[PDB]
Design a protein around this ligand. Sequence first.
Ligand code: HEM
Ligand code: HEM
Ligand code: HEM
Ligand code: HEM
Ligand SMILES: [Cl-]
Ligand SMILES: [Cl-]
Ligand code: NA
Lengths: 105, 107, 107, 105
Amino acid sequence: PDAMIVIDGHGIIQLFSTAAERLFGWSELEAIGQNVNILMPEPDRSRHDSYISRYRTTSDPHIIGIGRIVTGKRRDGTTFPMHLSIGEMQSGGEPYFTGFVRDLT
Amino acid sequence: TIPDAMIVIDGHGIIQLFSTAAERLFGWSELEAIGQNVNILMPEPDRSRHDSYISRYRTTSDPHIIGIGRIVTGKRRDGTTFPMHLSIGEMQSGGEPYFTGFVRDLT
Amino acid sequence: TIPDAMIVIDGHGIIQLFSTAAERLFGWSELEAIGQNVNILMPEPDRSRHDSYISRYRTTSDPHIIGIGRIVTGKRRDGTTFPMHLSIGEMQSGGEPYFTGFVRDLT
Amino acid sequence: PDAMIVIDGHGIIQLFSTAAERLFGWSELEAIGQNVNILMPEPDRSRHDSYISRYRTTSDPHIIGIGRIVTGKRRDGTTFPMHLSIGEMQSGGEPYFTGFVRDLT
Ligand code: HEM
Ligand code: HEM
Ligand code: HEM
Ligand code: HEM
Ligand SMILES: [Cl-]
Ligand SMILES: [Cl-]
Ligand code: NA
């Protein structure tokens, strides 16, 4: 599952793999530091922080360990179907989330 | 923060993804690392034992490093070793387990 | 097992030698390539960063690609891009650094 | 454009540049797979494997990074003064050497 993205518990991109660069069009340096919400169209884009926040409060997963086909958005605005799997992991008493993204095109 | 040296293995210890920073630290490119057992990145005897670490974790769900991390010793392609902090997370994709390893070089 | 596409640059990224298999792959004759910056064989953002990559190496002696290797994107004369594996070595001749890059087309 | 030859850790020619063809007379096809010692007169020709082996053993260079004027031998039997510079390269976990050959004639 080629394109990999790691975010912190606020949605901020920490790692952005070479497959993610080719899929999403953002260079790794550009993507790191940006909110992962840049990688999706509305309505998900404006809602994404809520999804993270809701998970952190509730611990109730919806995509983590479940996976879902969703719409992603390339740097150039174009949208594409993709499968999303997500994992969690802790470092320093903070969570980080790893996403694997499959371009269904 | 989280290290940028990241390694993804499947539930058989086979490297699936090997980040640029991991390439640099271990001295393998992803081209050569993908498909090899992650045990190539460590000295003996951990190397000979590592498949059992993974396999027994899968049957017991008793983690040792997962979620807490540990200072271990890594081995580069050229056989040189280094102290490293290892962080491991677990995930599921397509109903299969994968583990995400983050490595910080302590040289 | 070493690629037959081989490029040699000086310590300022300027192409010194361009093997026949580099010519095929990148679409430049050795005659046009020599004297140009190696950055012509790559897309942005690496292209406008490449001099800095070379100079950072000359400063730190800590390689990113030398002795490790990397999959990157190369760019042909015609503007089309391709996946490639890059290996790089360092040598010295007449007291100046030169870099020998070997390119494997991953298409 | 100077002549360029790549050999492996046992002195076997892996690449032989157009200028090396023009200079030494051997086509790249003919040169690849032969020992680099084909390109020199005696006694270097007989001793050359031992030069490579000592370098691999000791790491004490004599020409690598140093350069020397030596004599080179053409496919057609004739010899010629030449300057030699040698680099080391690792690819796929194994040593290669790159040689640059300046014809002094
Ligand atoms: C780029 C396309 C993405 C889309 C369209 C998307 C969409 C979604 C949606 C709809 C949810 C909420 C599920 C629900 O309430 O039904 C969600 C939750 C979440 N997403 Fe994203 N996401 C994307 C990328 C990512 C990536 C790449 C990561 C990690 C690096 C990530 C991390 C999370 C996390 C941690 C949650 C909360 C956990 C959960 O609800 O299971 N997302 N995402
Ligand atoms: C390269 C240097 C590494 C060394 C020296 C090393 C060593 C170890 C050791 C000694 C254990 C057993 C812990 C114990 O039983 O006390 C362990 C467990 C484990 N390691 Fe490795 N490891 C390394 C890299 C990695 C990486 C990069 C990953 C994932 C990509 C990984 C995945 C695992 C997993 C899944 C377990 C079982 C989970 C656990 O016990 O918490 N290892 N490792
Ligand atoms: C044509 C496609 C190429 C690309 C896309 C490329 C890109 C890069 C990148 C990404 C780095 C590391 C920068 C970093 O991670 O900070 C690098 C370093 C370097 N590259 Fe290039 N390169 C290419 C071709 C070559 C060639 C053919 C040579 C030699 C003839 C070369 C010589 C070097 C040197 C000397 C370094 C610094 C040494 C090091 O850090 O290991 N490049 N290059
Ligand atoms: C064609 C004419 C050549 C001659 C006469 C020649 C001669 C020599 C000599 C005399 C030495 C040993 C230094 C000493 O102990 O005095 C040497 C070492 C070596 N030569 Fe050659 N060589 C030739 C071509 C090449 C080429 C084209 C390569 C690489 C492609 C090469 C690779 C080496 C290597 C790797 C060593 C060991 C490194 C060292 O001692 O510095 N040689 N060669
Ligand atoms: Cl999944
Ligand atoms: Cl020299
Ligand atoms: Na950034």
